[PDB]
Structures are given as structure tokens and as C-alpha cells.
Symmetry: C2
Subunit: 296 residues, 2 copies
Amino acid sequence: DLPKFGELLQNVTVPVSREAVLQCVVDNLQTYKIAWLRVDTQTILTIQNHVITKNHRMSITHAEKRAWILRIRDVKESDKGWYMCQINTDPMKSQVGYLDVVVPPDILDYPTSTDMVIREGSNVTLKCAATGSPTPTITWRREGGELIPLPNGAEAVAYNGSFLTIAKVNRLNMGAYLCIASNGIPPTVSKRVMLIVHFPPMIWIQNQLVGAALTQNITLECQSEAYPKSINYWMKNDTIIVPGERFVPETFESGYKITMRLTIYEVDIQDFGAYRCVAKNSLGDTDGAIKLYHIP
Amino acid sequence: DLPKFGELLQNVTVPVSREAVLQCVVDNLQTYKIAWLRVDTQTILTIQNHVITKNHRMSITHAEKRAWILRIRDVKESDKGWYMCQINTDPMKSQVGYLDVVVPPDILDYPTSTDMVIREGSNVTLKCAATGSPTPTITWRREGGELIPLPNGAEAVAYNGSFLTIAKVNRLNMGAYLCIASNGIPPTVSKRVMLIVHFPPMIWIQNQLVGAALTQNITLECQSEAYPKSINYWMKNDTIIVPGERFVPETFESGYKITMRLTIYEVDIQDFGAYRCVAKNSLGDTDGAIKLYHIP
Ligand SMILES: *[C@@H]1O[C@H](CO[C@@H]2O[C@@H](C)[C@@H](O)[C@@H](O)[C@@H]2O)[C@@H](O[C@@H]2O[C@H](CO)[C@@H](O[C@@H]3O[C@H](CO[C@H]4O[C@H](CO)[C@@H](O)[C@H](O)[C@@H]4O)[C@@H](O)[C@H](O[C@H]4O[C@H](CO)[C@@H](O)[C@H](O)[C@@H]4O)[C@@H]3O)[C@H](O)[C@H]2NC(C)=O)[C@H](O)[C@H]1NC(C)=O
Ligand SMILES: *[C@@H]1O[C@H](CO[C@@H]2O[C@@H](C)[C@@H](O)[C@@H](O)[C@@H]2O)[C@@H](O[C@@H]2O[C@H](CO)[C@@H](O[C@@H]3O[C@H](CO[C@H]4O[C@H](CO)[C@@H](O)[C@H](O)[C@@H]4O)[C@@H](O)[C@H](O[C@H]4O[C@H](CO)[C@@H](O)[C@H](O)[C@@H]4O)[C@@H]3O)[C@H](O)[C@H]2NC(C)=O)[C@H](O)[C@H]1NC(C)=O
Ligand SMILES: *[C@@H]1O[C@H](CO[C@@H]2O[C@@H](C)[C@@H](O)[C@@H](O)[C@@H]2O)[C@@H](O[C@@H]2O[C@H](CO)[C@@H](O[C@@H]3O[C@H](CO)[C@@H](O)[C@H](O)[C@@H]3O)[C@H](O)[C@H]2NC(C)=O)[C@H](O)[C@H]1NC(C)=O
Ligand SMILES: *[C@@H]1O[C@H](CO[C@@H]2O[C@@H](C)[C@@H](O)[C@@H](O)[C@@H]2O)[C@@H](O[C@@H]2O[C@H](CO)[C@@H](O[C@@H]3O[C@H](CO)[C@@H](O)[C@H](O)[C@@H]3O)[C@H](O)[C@H]2NC(C)=O)[C@H](O)[C@H]1NC(C)=O
Ligand SMILES: *[C@@H]1O[C@H](CO)[C@@H](O)[C@H](O)[C@H]1NC(C)=O
Ligand SMILES: *[C@@H]1O[C@H](CO)[C@@H](O)[C@H](O)[C@H]1NC(C)=O
């Protein structure tokens, strides 16, 4: 009888630089001969245990009589396509299989965004592009799973698309953003973009009117938000307040927030008047008004 | 340097059963290797001096370092197509050429006409079909270069087309017809058709009135055309004339024509009267009237 393939030639799918192993099997080969050969380029590759193509990445093995195994190391995209296992017969017998090569995902340095910095109330567009086969899918997230403002006013945890535009950025939008590019092949990779925001400081004051008697210890207080962090000092009569045992100012800073106090000890009659808490940063300055008055 | 073809791979064209010789040449082959292989069927054939395909009609020769000559004996139509000469290189180098197989011409036994026979005044259609590649061209002629009646009433020496129709055949159309089928490849062949015609006889008479005196020798004469040839006898008084020394009838036949005489020696007075020349064949009979009368 004539030889015939023992098991169909199977589809393979390999990543770049890896090794590809294509396996052809034949029952009862007698004195006939097997040949591998790329189809598209119509190029002979191997015959029996002898390799033809000078392409040194290709190799044949005859470990068992059944299997004639073709091996392609350091695989490349050019190598992918159709491959034929052929048996010298009249007529000739051949089964054919496909090798799909695949590339992991990669994020580019351009136009991929870097650590960007924009003023509050402004615009931005965190771009991210990546290469891959299959053409990868890009997804944005935030390190603390924070929200991501959407163009409709709603907000979610993961936005798709290479280009993400935020309108009128807010100090809450500030944080660590992650571009994630997955092609479905390991290892998926991601780049960390830093969105920092600066804003002219602003001052809130709980009690703009506080009273005190003599010999009592009282503390004024304001609340500011400034980035970069703001220099916060007290004023009275259009003059700086330097702590002189009787009056001591403090500041308690947390991120862009700042809570400043001016603790007045043993209130004197000359202390009463109009105070001001001022805040100043690279983008402007601001102040508030607190009035200290008498009890009786 | 790398090898390269010395002379382009040339187009061949061969007839069936013959031998085909395809010649590939390469300059500076070093340790590389040549391979022949059919393109369409993607089938490897030969490599170096070793033949792969079990097709025993194929053979490689390395007579000179230049030429790697592939030889295909007892060529068949299935063999024709594209053939590639390949050199194992990375990338691979290959030049390709076409083998066109050709078949001489042949006339079939059917529906090819045979020796046909039709009555005069009737129709006929001398058919002739032939096979060949290129599809051959059929031409009709006549052995004596005679004319060939055309459907418009005109006449020529050679008509094209497989089917030739003659309307109301005439005895002049009778003769040897030749079907000729040429494909442009030797040896062109031709079949000889025989067109025979039968016709009820007809009689012409030059002198329907002849006079004679006594003791004179006179000869009557008619002219007939009959096919198949007609039996021509003389009549007088509704009775057959059998030669009895005084009267002797003759016949001079040429093809379908016949010229009959009745030579009367020493005319008697009882001889004068009404004679008749009769002609009879398979398709009917006919006669004429000659009156013999006196001089004084
Ligand atoms: C082994 O894999 C073979 C290759 O497939 C690749 O590898 C696998 C592992 C996956 O990664 C896969 O995603 C890859 O594509 C595989 O061959 C594939 O088989 C399918 C189905 O048989 C083919 O789909 C058909 O493709 C044809 C032609 O498309 C080509 O030509 C056009 C130009 O004309 C190009 O633009 C394309 O990009 C392609 O190159 C289509 O005509 C056809 O659609 C028609 O037929 C269907 C019904 O069958 C109708 O419903 C439609 O309306 C059309 O009328 C299909 O789309 C696919 O093309 C083919 N891949 C390649 C590269 O040719 C093979 O099947 C696998 N074998 C085994 C044993 O697993
Ligand atoms: C060696 O011979 C090759 C084969 O030629 C045969 O063998 C020779 C010895 C002769 O006997 C000859 O009569 C045989 O045909 C020869 O290849 C031939 O090259 C010519 C010209 O290069 C080709 O003509 C072109 O064919 C294409 C495709 O036609 C095929 O496909 C259609 C279906 O799509 C089929 O129906 C046909 O039957 C064919 O199978 C046409 O598209 C093309 O026309 C177009 O291009 C021209 C301009 O080039 C335009 O003007 C037109 O309008 C069209 O846009 C031509 O008609 C011929 O097909 C091809 N033969 C074969 C079998 O493919 C080769 O060139 C020779 N080489 C040398 C070195 O001598
Ligand atoms: C800062 O960003 C805002 C809004 O941000 C973006 O706005 C859209 C263009 C989309 O990209 C959104 O996905 C995204 O959130 C910009 O305001 C927007 O400006 C465009 C351009 O003028 C407006 O488009 C207009 O649409 C009308 C139809 O209603 C057309 O007739 C116009 O011709 C024009 O195309 C868009 O409506 C507007 N959106 C909002 C919410 O204001 C803003 O321009 C941008 N800053 C700068 C300097 O460009
Ligand atoms: C014997 O042969 C004659 C003529 O021979 C052939 O006539 C043509 C049909 C062509 O094949 C010629 O190449 C060839 O010499 C036959 O007489 C022909 O008969 C046909 C069929 O009736 C006539 O065709 C007609 O044409 C008119 C248009 O004028 C149409 O309206 C009709 O419907 C019909 O198709 C043809 O004119 C006629 N030709 C002559 C010269 O008489 C004859 O029929 C044939 N014998 C038999 C028994 O068929
Ligand atoms: C886009 O993101 C949304 C939110 O997770 C999800 O529903 C959708 O499937 C995503 N689209 C793609 C193509 O992944
Ligand atoms: C048909 O015959 C005529 C008469 O000889 C000739 O002119 C013509 O070239 C012929 N046609 C072909 C295709 O040979």
C-alpha cells in the first residue's frame, strides 16, 4: 500500500524569538521520502534528515519513524505563513498547516504621555499608544482605583481608548494614572503616568468672629489649599506677626491642604483688632479676615 | 559572492509522448544546491543529481557544472504547466519557465461523414470534426481542385468550417472531397469523403428527323446521362431491336454519359418509320423519338 498521514498537520502559534516545532507523521513510509517546504515562497526547506535551506534557524529530526519534526528557532514575523509536509509520490501527497507568529505588547515612548503637569481648571489629554499582534487594547486606570471624569459628566474606574481627554482638571483628578496595553499574549505591560495639578491657593475660615476676655488663651484658625504648598503667615495692622512668647503661629500640612493656627496666650487689650491669614504660592496669593473682640 | 542564473530559463513547447528537456544554468554554485519542482502542484521533483519524485519519466543530468538539465520522456498533457528551478539560498533564488504541451490533429470517425450517396437535386451536409491543441482548423477541397457550390450561388476552391451544406446537388458536384484539419503542428491529416450522386436518366437527340434512300448505310444516334449507368436499347413498333446483320446497335459509355447508335445497312422500304432510343436505370426510364423517312 501507499503511505498516508497518520495524524493531521496541526496549527501552531508561536511568539517572536521563540522556537517553532511543526510535526508531520506518516504511516508505512517504506522507501518514500518526506519534505518540508514553505508554501507562499514556494521554498524547499528539508528532506528526510537532510536540511536544504541555508537558513540556519531550521532543523529536522527523525527521532521516531513516525514523526518528521521541523524546528525553527529564533522565530521571526517573516517566517510566519503556510508550511507543507510533502511525500514524494505519483501523484504527490501533501498536508498543509499554518504557523501564526505573535508579538507581545509594547508601549512606545512617543506620542505616549509622560508625567504631565497642568493648572487646575485647564485641559489635558493623556495619550498612550502601543504595538502588538493582535493589535492590543489600551485601558486607563488609577492606582487607588479612583474615578476618571468622563466627557458626559459621569465617572468610572476604567476608560478604553488610546486618547483620554479630561476637561477642567480638578485637584481630585490629581494622582497616578496607569496606561494598560493588552494584546491577549503575556506579558501584558503598563506605563504609569503622573498627572499633577497646581492651583492658586484658597482660604476657608470657620469662625470669622471670635471673642475673648483678658488672661484667657485663644487660638484663631484658617484652612487653605495650595499647590505647590503655600507659605502661610498672619497679619495685623498690615504687618507680619512674628511669634514673641505671647503669640505663636502653627501650620499643619497634608498634601495640598494646610491648617494654620495663631495661639494667643494671656489676651491683652492691645491684641484685639483685625487679623488676617494669608496664603501665597507660585500661582497667586489670598487672605481672610478674622475679628477678635471683647466679651464685656 | 552568491550564485546567480547564467541564462534565463527558456520557454519550451513539446508534443505528446515526446521527450521534454528543460535546462537551468547557474554561475558559481559553490556548495549550494539546485532543485527542480512543478509549480502548480507545488511538487518537488529533483535535487542535484538525485531524483525525488517516483514519477519514472523524470530524470536529471549534471553533464556540465553549468547545466542542470531536467528530462521528461513520454510527455503527457497533465505534465504541462509551470516549472521552477530553485537554488537553496536565504533568501531563496528561483527562475521559472512554462512547458506547453501540444497534440497533433486527429479526425474522428463520428460525426465525420463517410462515403455518402444522394440523388441529384437533393440536399447533403458533409460534416467533419477533428481534435487538436491548438483547436485545429478544418478546410474542404476537391481532388481535382474542382469548385464547391456556396450557399449564395457563387463557387470557390476551399471552404472553411466543419459543416458544409450543398443544396440541390448536381452531377458535377460528384467527385472526391477532402476534409483537411490543421492545427499548425505536424503532421496535418485529411480524410477523403466520396460524394456520389444518382439521377434518373435523360436523353438528348441531335437529329430527330433523318432521311435515307435505298442501298444507303445510315446511323441514328442519341445521348443519355444515367447513374447508375443505364441500359440503352432501341425500339420500333413497340418492339425491341435485336441486331440481325442489317441493323446493329452500339453504345459508348463515359462515366454517367452514354452515346448509343443504331447503324442501319442497306436501307429497305420496310425500315422507314418511327424509332425510339430508351434509357433505363434504378431511378426511372426515358426515351426519345427519331423519324426515318424517304428521300424521293
Ligand atoms: C489554521 O490557521 C489558519 C490561519 O488562521 C490564522 O491563524 C489562526 C491560528 C488564528 O490566529 C487566526 O486568527 C489567523 O487568521 C486558518 O486559515 C484561516 O481559515 C479561515 C476560515 O477557514 C479563513 O477565513 C476565510 O478567509 C477568506 C479569505 O480571506 C483572505 O483573503 C482576503 C482577501 O480576499 C484578505 O483580506 C484576508 O485578510 C485573508 O487574507 C474569506 O474569503 C472567508 O470568508 C468567506 O467565507 C465564509 C464562509 O467560509 C463566508 O461566510 C464569508 O462571507 C466569505 O464568503 C473567511 O473569512 C482565514 O482567511 C484563514 N487564514 C488565512 C491567513 O488565510 C486555518 O483554517 C487553520 N487550520 C486549522 C486546521 O486549524
Ligand atoms: C512562456 O509561456 C507562458 C505561457 O504561454 C503559453 O505558452 C506559450 C509557449 C504559447 O503557447 C502561449 O500561447 C501559451 O499561452 C507565457 O505566459 C503567458 O504570458 C502572457 C503574457 O505575459 C499571458 O497573457 C496574460 O494572461 C493574463 C491572465 O490570463 C489567465 O487567467 C485568465 C483568468 O483570469 C484565464 O481565463 C486565462 O486563460 C489565463 O489562464 C491576462 O490577464 C493578461 O491580460 C491582461 O494584461 C494585458 C497587458 O499585459 C492587458 O492588455 C489585458 O487587457 C489584461 O489586462 C494577458 O492576457 C498568459 O496568460 C500567460 N500564459 C499563462 C498560461 O498564464 C510566458 O510569458 C512565456 N515566457 C517567456 C519567457 O517566453
Ligand atoms: C477643553 O475641553 C473641552 C471639552 O473637552 C472635550 O470636548 C469635546 C470636543 C470632546 O473631545 C469631549 O470628549 C471632551 O470632553 C472643550 O470644549 C469643547 O470644545 C469643542 C470645540 O469647540 C466643542 O465641539 C463643538 O461642538 C458643536 C456641536 O455642539 C459644534 O457645532 C462645534 O463646531 C464644535 O465642534 C465641544 O462641544 C466642547 N465641549 C464642552 C463640554 O465644552 C474645550 O474646547 C477644550 N479647550 C480648548 C482650548 O480647546
Ligand atoms: C436544403 O437546403 C436548402 C438551402 O440550403 C441551406 O439553406 C440555409 C438554411 C442555410 O443553411 C444555407 O447555408 C444552406 O445553403 C434549404 O432551404 C433553406 O431552408 C431554410 C429553412 O426554411 C430557409 O431559412 C428560412 O429563412 C427565412 C428568412 O428568409 C426565415 O424566415 C425562415 O424561418 C427560415 O429560417 C432558407 O432561406 C432556405 N434557403 C434556400 C436557398 O432555399 C432547404 O430547406 C433544405 N432542405 C430541407 C429538407 O430542409
Ligand atoms: C470598554 O470598557 C468598558 C468598561 O469596563 C467595558 O464594558 C467594555 O467591554 C470595554 N471594551 C473593550 C473592547 O474592552
Ligand atoms: C477561410 O477561407 C478563405 C478562402 O481561402 C480565406 O480567405 C480565409 O483566410 C479562411 N479563414 C481561415 C480562418 O483560415
